[PDB]
Design a protein around this ligand. Structure first.
Ligand SMILES: [Cl-]
Ligand SMILES: [Cl-]
Length: 309
């Protein structure tokens, strides 16, 4: 009777998270000599956004890797990752995650019996709708789908737009029948879930990030025999390295496919347009500073590094 272990997520197989979870499966089975069988369930086939945390708590799923925007019901510290324009680029996000404060966040939910094993990457968020979004004013009066995050809701409220919380699996349909006008996501997600086919203008804003925390039930994980836990720990580290190697290329490749399709128009901001977007979104920070903790915010800010000039 081999031990069945299930890994659930909401994205497609051909994605930074999807490819990493498949690597994890392959390696955990190898390193346990077949004693463990990993079943991977992509595209919300087993659980989606709304239920995966509960599934982990009850033992219906062993591994998940939610966006870092989806934890504000469990802690008020991880929501630091949602502050718009906090990180200039993916390199700053990774430096922050690797430092003391970023690594501390993996343990931020231990009192609720959740444990983060690793961070996985996706990429930078782009914004889209059915009209060009070149300046923040263009967003006024539009409905935007958002992940279930208080800071993302405030971010759109601040643009005098209307956020709407929806589960990832429901976004395409919402955009397709017009119950929402726009959204923010990474190129990888925008291509693989076909948002580009129902959004005619996408702006390369790079105004936030979608990255992930690999989460387990702490009690379950810590109760495993030393030999099984080491095997799976080895598999996880190696899957995390695949994720770090493929995330960038997969997003670049997605962007190109969207562009080549002709179905959407990709817009590039200029310095003055971008600077405007920054000003229009920064007040959100002051609203959440006390809840997050200024020091954590300052450490994130400091993770940015710009070459001279
Ligand atoms: Cl979902
Ligand atoms: Cl990590």
């Amino acid at each position: 009777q081999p031990i069945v272990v299930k890994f659930s997520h909401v994205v497609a197989d051909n994605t930074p998270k999807g490819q990493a979870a498949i690597k994890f499966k392959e390696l955990a089975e190898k390193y346990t000599n077949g004693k463990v069988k990993v079943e991977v369930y992509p595209n919300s086939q087993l659980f989606g956004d709304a239920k995966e945390m509960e599934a982990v708590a009850l033992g219906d799923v062993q591994f998940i890797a939610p966006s870092l925007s989806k934890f504000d019901k469990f802690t008020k510290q991880i929501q630091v990752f949602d502050l718009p324009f906090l990180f200039n680029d993916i390199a700053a996000v990774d430096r922050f995650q690797a430092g003391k404060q970023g690594q501390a966040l993996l343990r931020s939910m231990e009192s609720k019996n959740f444990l983060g094993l690793a961070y996985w990457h996706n990429g930078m968020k782009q914004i889209s709708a059915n009209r060009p979004l070149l300046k923040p004013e263009d967003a006024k009066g539009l409905k935007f789908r958002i992940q279930a995050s208080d800071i993302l809701a405030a971010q759109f409220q601040g643009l005098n737009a209307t956020p709407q919380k929806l589960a990832f699996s429901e976004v395409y349909q919402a955009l397709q029948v017009g119950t929402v006008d726009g959204q923010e996501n990474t190129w990888s997600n925008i291509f693989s879930q076909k948002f580009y086919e129902v959004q005619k203008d996408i702006t390369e804003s790079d105004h936030g990030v979608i990255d992930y925390m690999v989460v387990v039930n702490a009690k379950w994980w810590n109760g495993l025999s030393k030999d099984l836990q080491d095997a799976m720990k080895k598999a996880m580290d190696e899957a995390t390295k695949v994720n770090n190697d493929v995330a960038g290329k997969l997003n670049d490749e997605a962007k190109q496919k969207i562009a080549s399709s002709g179905a959407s128009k990709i817009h590039q901001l200029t310095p003055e347009q971008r600077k405007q977007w920054v000003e229009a979104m920064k007040p959100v920070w002051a609203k959440f500073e006390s809840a997050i903790g200024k020091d954590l915010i300052d450490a994130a800010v400091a993770s940015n590094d710009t070459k001279t000039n």
